[PDB]
């Protein structure tokens, strides 16, 4: 069982149809290079608007139901025969989420995952827009494989990766948007960010895919202009956490790595980390302060 | 710029003859429509006297099935003729069950369904518990031609849970037909101020406009223990999304209240304020108890 | 001076003995239906499986083939003509064949002769003398009410009458009167069992708890059936009766006479009494989930 | 005649509106029942005072007390322990802002086994219980006592076959119903006593379990918001067998101690053999979870 | 190459003493274990004579609760000692309901839960409908240390629906404890060949091995109408995944039957045959009727 | 005493010439009738070689519409002449759809309607998938002058659900025209015993007789890869209501199997055994899933 996977890395304008045209052109090229499962970066429908905390930007959200972009990638997914996770800003009555729709090989929409861990701070004011996720971590059974799909900031938490691997995830996927921070140009998070994810891969014995955007984006915030240089470094790690394919910080990229899933599962089962786990001693992970279980 | 909706609260006195009262409601619905109304709200159990001052066997038989109801059917023609949304309050018989109900008529005459009053009041003058099974529809919202609306009934207006339930389901405007006034056992009770404040609270906490239509007039009912009298205090009103009263009637006059809301700006104002983004349903389990400890089955 | 308003309806319970010849028993039924109609009856109730002996004392292959389809049933068709002639409602109890399934059924014939449909016995009894589980699939129509020319009625069959759930299911759906055709008597394996008083009190309890009148028609006579282990006898104990909405018995037959019982009810006054008493206003379905278990803990799928 | 035997008792008495007096009365009669061999003794509903629900008064709501350290429950626990008898104690419960018509089941060793909160709440002239009590939220319960597994419910609950069946399905071997019922102050023509008995006898026969009903006697006048209101409570406390037969019954005005012995092993055997529980059709009972015959409640 | 499992069907005659019969089971389980068995199947209602020839009040009281059942508890010790999976058939009392049930004990002694007999037979010699409520667990599969298995009971074995339900839920092997023999009212009835053919059919249609353990011996029961005799015919067998019988007992002696199955090669063979991807559940709705027309509720 | 019906299973080798095969079918139907048959079953797709081996474009044109089918019409004449029921297997063209189908002809020559094969497999020697859409008729029963019958086709015969569906609706006899033999990929599998066991299973579980007609002979079709060959193993048989084989053919010669059944006695036996009285459809919802969890 040989599933091919791809990481995509492009620049965005602040125009839905031009951006979707970009993803649509890079997904078709992935399929040309033999891709089965194609990953598109976070909130690629537009500029990373979370630098500002503006009332009108909340109204960029749209319902999950009959979503114009989901609907347009389902046709593309079905025609190529590729799995495609679709990042979008979701409105649900008065709730709002940073969410992703998993569209299978036949165009079928298999459901939704809602970003659980929400970042905050200058340039990344995501807590102003998103309710923290209520779906829980999910695995999606696709024609090619069982896949763990979470979103951006979720990639920093070992709990997310572990939860997905416990639920049958043969591969983990993370659509991302990260770069410089507008308040301090001395902050360079690229090495640290790769390292944390490399750790999830090696600890669970599952390959990993991270798609991150590039280019410069200037947002008109409530306090004047704010700029981010997204640093790319979209990559694919193997089940031991090794970097097999890696993009640069500036150029557009279409990554590919083929994995023998049945043999990676024999590698995982023989190492026996899952049978060796001690859930009886992990109750402290249900606390925030290291003593009080949350309700 | 944005979807606009003109809403209206009506306030009038009732005899105990259905034909008269429906004729009265029709006259006021037309006057609201002449002033630009798209959704018009008629007071609770308007077809007759507020009979719940008595606990009488024979009054139970005022109920009628939802199916082919002559007052709903008559008002469906009006809605369609005028292009107006009309929630119609009525006493429902459903086999051996009975409910204080309301059917939502859309601007094209279409009966969109019903809501059965959930919280049932009790005590001298307001013996509703004797007549109505507690509602089993749960809180609802209705997609009309002008807006998603949440309609509940009278006593439901005192419960933040009901307004919150409707808002969570996408209600853009809340409506409460009412029958409230003095209490026959104690002349010192005057609940009008308290009544308004609690509702203003719902409107401000959910950032949605709110409409309340209340009865006026004195009604004297023969009860199992003699005459009982209520002076209904009107005070029908419309409140905006921060709870401010934008239209209000006095305690005796017949009234047609009008108010226009921009529903796209309000949606935008509601999301911006962030309350729905910040709710903690994980910490609200206690609300599924009556006694602060034991969850209900 | 005027009569008290409200729809009146006159109901009747019949009580008779059967032979094992279908023509003789339908002739008996028709004679008694006509006698009931002569006394003013609007709805007449014939006892369970009246077409023959209560054959369920035996567990025999050949007795299963006594079933017949609901479609073009000779007995139903014949009683349809009688109902139309007299202008009376007649529920018709019969053993139904439905491809490979079999049921103990009842067809409700309206006062204009129209077949309004069927109910299939839900609770199936078992044991010496009453081996019904051998013949009948448990009913799959669920509890029903039928809108007749005179009233909305609830009809169930024999063993069903021991279950408060059935009576309440019918009342909840608007049944204004309950009917139960019955075949019950002595038990061949133990002559000390005399269930007649127990039988009455359970049904009177249904009428009182739902505030609806109730009609039970039961068989009389001794019947001997040839079983796989020899002859077995039941003495059917009659006691057909009509009960009012507080459970009071208004008419009752003895254990051996042929009877035509007659009682008039004002359905509008009883409706009003039923609602004022308030039991239906006060019910707690939220606490009744345990009723959907057999063992008090596990809900059935 | 082998098998576990249990002796049950129904008490019937008049109440004043003073708590100390009425509890002294209950203790007198529980001792009289025990002297006659009773193992489980049933005291009538809200016996601590007059049946105050004829009125709808603010101040009457404050007669309620917490379940915790309830003085009447504590006093009767001592008596239960002294005599070795099971004693259900009816009381008006305050639980934060909720209020219930409740009953605490005291075992023969004096242990508080838990509470049942009245589910079906009556309403109308003379019986304005819906003004005082939240409808109960414990659900129907059964309690394992030293003598038997029992099902205890309260007053108006006795009209509902669903409550008896719920208790039977969960193993209840005897059903107990403390009661307060009599005339109705708005219409002297209403006499519910035969209807009342008939419905309970229905429960006993349909579930094949014995049933004990203890009812109040005497005239009571309550000062209501609209003037005096009077009820004459009609007694008729009784004990029914597993076929619904009345085995013991009191009149409408006598103070009474009723006594009945039951063989629970033989009744269990009879119950199972009759087959009603073997033959039930819960797959066809969903309509029971509706009020209107059509719509399942949330 | 793959996960191997050795299964066993046991066959013996019952006495009227419980302990004797559990000890007979214990002796035969140890004999299966000695010959390499991992999962061992004991016949239906093995604790005593097949009492269902009679319809008696006192026989119903032979039932016992699932909780702290002495026979289940004793067999748990044996399961843990030998490291063998043991399904334990028993007559369950559950408040007022009664069932013909079976508890699946895992190789470490753990009680995995129970299955209640779904299809209850009836007629002379087999009056089971008098004793048991139809099962309400539905068909189940259990995950044991050696395999996911489907266990159903006696009469259940005549129904293609039970066997399919278990395989669809992942059963790798079907098990059917049985009590079947002659019929007391008609000596011409010999159902043994028909009985095997139907099960062999289940094995072949689902491509899973099947094990059936049947009783031997003549039993005379005192019924309400005199003596009734059944001659139990044994013929316990184990069938492979195409329905071929690979081990079979005679009609009169004790037997310990043993067979090994490569469950991964069988899984692969089942997947390859493809029957399960080729089913048409969209065309099977009539299976939810009894009469070929009306779906049950 | 009771309705007696004589049924027949025919078995022969096909040539790849339509006329010849139809003439062969006719000869054997007449032979069956001469031995007393009332209902006669001809094997699946008898008009030619079993072509589902290969996946060829020109083979699709062997399909013909249900209306005015020349083989059906000719067999209608034969049914009316002799007074025998004849289910006619054929390759149906219906617009953008094609089906493996069978039309039931009554003893008076009346076309009673059709059933379209429901279960469509894959695999070498039997690539049914490329030629036939999944049947949309559902499982049917047909009332003939002699009995209510249920008919299903080739691959359908592995599915207990189809046999049960027919029996629930009144089928008193089940008919299964088929084509099965070796597999061109590996000559070690011999499925004839597995096949018989599953069908005997359906006869015994539903207490209905069952007739299966299978072809004999070797057949070589030129395909995409190269010459594919199959040896059809015959073994046509008639089973009774307990699943006993009452009549059976070998793997190499023509046969006309005959068996008489008393449908009234069998119906009485079926009901007394009780399986239909004892079914639990309230516990069978999982059967409306493919994966054993989610309804379709």
From TrEMBL, chains B, E:
Its EC number is 3.5.1.53. GO terms for biological process: putrescine biosynthetic process from arginine. InterPro entries: Aliph_Amidase/BUP, C-N_Hydrolase, C-N_Hydrolase_sf, N-carbamoylputrescine_amidase. GO terms for molecular function: N-carbamoylputrescine amidase activity. Gene3D superfamilies: Carbon-nitrogen hydrolase. It is an enzyme of class 3 (hydrolase). Pathway: Amine and polyamine biosynthesis; putrescine biosynthesis via agmatine pathway; putrescine from N-carbamoylputrescine (amidase route): step 1/1. Residues 5-263 form the CN hydrolase domain. Keywords: Hydrolase, Polyamine biosynthesis. This is N-carbamoylputrescine amidase. It comes from Medicago truncatula. The lineage of its organism: Eukaryota, Viridiplantae, Streptophyta, Embryophyta, Tracheophyta.
Automatic annotation (TrEMBL), chain C:
Transmembrane segments: none annotated. PROSITE patterns: CN_HYDROLASE. GO terms for molecular function: N-carbamoylputrescine amidase activity. Its EC number is 3.5.1.53. The lineage of its organism: Eukaryota, Viridiplantae, Streptophyta, Embryophyta, Tracheophyta. Pathway: Amine and polyamine biosynthesis; putrescine biosynthesis via agmatine pathway; putrescine from N-carbamoylputrescine (amidase route): step 1/1. The keyword ATP-binding does not apply. Belongs to the carbon-nitrogen hydrolase superfamily. One of its GO terms (biological process) is putrescine biosynthetic process from arginine. This is N-carbamoylputrescine amidase. It comes from Medicago truncatula. The keyword Protein transport does not apply. Residues 9-267 form the CN hydrolase domain. Keywords: Hydrolase, Polyamine biosynthesis. It is an enzyme of class 3 (hydrolase).
């Amino acid at each position: 069982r040989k599933v091919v996977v791809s990481a995509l890395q492009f620049a965005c304008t602040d125009d839905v149809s031009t951006n979707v045209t970009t993803a649509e052109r890079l997904v078709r090229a992935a399929h040309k290079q033999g891709a089965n499962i194609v990953l598109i970066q976070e909130l690629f429908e537009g500029y990373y608007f979370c630098q500002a905390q503006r009332e009108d930007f909340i109204q960029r959200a749209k319902p999950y139901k009959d979503h114009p972009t989901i609907m347009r990638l389902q046709k593309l997914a079905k025609e190529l025969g590729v799995v495609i996770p679709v990042s979008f800003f979701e409105e649900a009555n008065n709730a709002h989420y940073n969410s992703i729709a998993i569209i299978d090989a036949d165009g079928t929409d298999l459901g939704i995952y809602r970003k659980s861990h929400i970042p905050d701070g200058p340039g990344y004011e995501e807590k102003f827009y998103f309710n923290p996720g209520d779906t829980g971590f999910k695995v999606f059974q696709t024609k090619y494989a069982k896949i763990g799909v979470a979103i951006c900031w979720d990639q920093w938490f070992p709990e997310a990766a572990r939860a997905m691997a416990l639920q049958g995830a043969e591969i983990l996927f993370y659509p991302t948007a990260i770069g410089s921070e507008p308040h301090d140009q001395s902050i360079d998070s690229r090495d640290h960010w790769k390292r944390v994810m490399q750790g999830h891969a090696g600890a669970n014995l599952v390959p990993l895919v991270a798609s991150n955007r590039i280019g410069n984006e200037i947002i008109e915030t409530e306090h004047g202009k704010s700029e981010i240089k997204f640093y790319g470094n979209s990559f694919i790690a193997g089940p031991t956490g090794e970097i097999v394919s890696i993009a640069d910080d500036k150029e557009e990229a279409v990554l590919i790595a083929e994995f023998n899933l049945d043999k990676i599962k024999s590698m995982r089962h023989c190492w026996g980390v899952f049978r060796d786990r001690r859930p009886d001693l992990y109750k402290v992970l249900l606390t925030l302060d290291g003593k009080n279980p949350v309700l």
